[PDB]
């Protein structure tokens, strides 16, 4: 298992514009297009991201290219963030992937907001962090996914994703 496989499980793959859990226009493997309510605004961003007139539909190859860029960006966002970097550097490979997943989902700003949890992860207090991570809107809105990421931080293994 790796970050790509993990996120592919959590986000799925859709080749036509769709609405995410929050009602925002998205495509491919969780690539957010816009928070705007307009499908046209979404189609415009899509075309600009792909470089061609898509008409709201893309190919598998194109979805994977957006995905590669998005994972890369998440990683680079963590390394540039004063609050996240030190956490990321202190973690083992499985747990780093869990932090990337959260950033991919909610953005660097959002994750950096989890001050107390971050401090606990840094201290390697796994069970404590897991409980604190669960006291969040994130967990309440997307509990199944949140549980998978939380289990990864708690155990340091990929157990939550093997079977999926
Ligand atoms: Cl883009
Ligand atoms: Cl969920």
């Amino acid at each position: 298992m790796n970050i790509f496989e993990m996120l592919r499980i959590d986000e799925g793959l859709r080749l036509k514009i769709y609405k995410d859990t929050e009602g925002y226009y998205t495509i491919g493997i969780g690539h957010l297009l816009t928070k705007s309510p307009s499908l046209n605004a979404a189609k415009s961003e899509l075309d600009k991201a792909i470089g061609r007139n898509t008409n709201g539909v893309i190919t598998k190859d194109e979805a994977e290219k957006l995905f590669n860029q998005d994972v890369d960006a998440a990683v680079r966002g963590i390394l540039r963030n004063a609050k996240l970097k030190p956490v990321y550097d202190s973690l083992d490979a499985v747990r780093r992937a869990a932090l990337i997943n959260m950033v991919f989902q909610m953005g660097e700003t959002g994750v950096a907001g989890f001050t107390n949890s971050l401090r606990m992860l840094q201290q390697k207090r796994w069970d404590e962090a897991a409980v604190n991570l669960a006291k969040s809107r994130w967990y309440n809105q997307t509990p199944n996914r949140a549980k998978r990421v939380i289990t990864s931080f708690r155990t340091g293994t990929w157990d939550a994703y093997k079977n999926l």
Side-chain angles (χ1 to χ4, degrees), residues 71-85:
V71 170
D72 196 67
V75 179
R76 291 173 99 356
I78 281 169
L79 305 170
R80 294 197 247 97
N81 187 293
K83 305 195 63 222
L84 301 174
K85 190 190 189 282

Side-chain angles (χ1 to χ4, degrees), residues 35-127:
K35 294 193 207 153
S36 159
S38 174
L39 178 63
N40 295 289
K43 287 175 159 218
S44 174
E45 289 291 314
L46 180 56
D47 286 354
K48 160 165 77 81
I50 300 309
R52 78 198 175 58
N53 234 83
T54 66
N55 196 40
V57 185
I58 60 171
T59 72
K60 200 190 178 73
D61 263 58
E62 284 168 340
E64 282 168 351
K65 179 169 234 213
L66 291 179
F67 186 41
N68 279 321
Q69 295 172 170
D70 290 342
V71 170
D72 196 67
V75 179
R76 291 173 99 356
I78 281 169
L79 305 170
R80 294 197 247 97
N81 187 293
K83 305 195 63 222
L84 301 174
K85 190 190 189 282
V87 182
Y88 186 88
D89 285 346
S90 78
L91 296 167
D92 58 87
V94 176
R95 298 186 168 93
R96 282 178 181 174
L99 189 67
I100 297 171
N101 190 309
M102 290 179 75
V103 173
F104 183 98
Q105 183 187 359
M106 66 199 107
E108 111 178 34
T109 305
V111 182
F114 287 58
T115 305
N116 306 319
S117 301
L118 296 172
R119 183 182 82 245
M120 289 164 208
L121 287 167
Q122 201 163 349
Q123 295 182 85
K124 315 203 176 290
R125 298 164 143 65
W126 318 123
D127 289 14

Side-chain angles (χ1 to χ4, degrees), residues 21 141-146 148:
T21 69
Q141 295 311 127
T142 49
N144 286 326
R145 182 191 186 146
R148 288 194 292 271

Side-chain angles (χ1 to χ4, degrees), residues 128-141:
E128 298 148 66
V131 166
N132 185 268
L133 278 164
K135 303 180 172 177
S136 60
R137 170 181 206 272
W138 170 58
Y139 179 87
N140 289 99
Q141 295 311 127

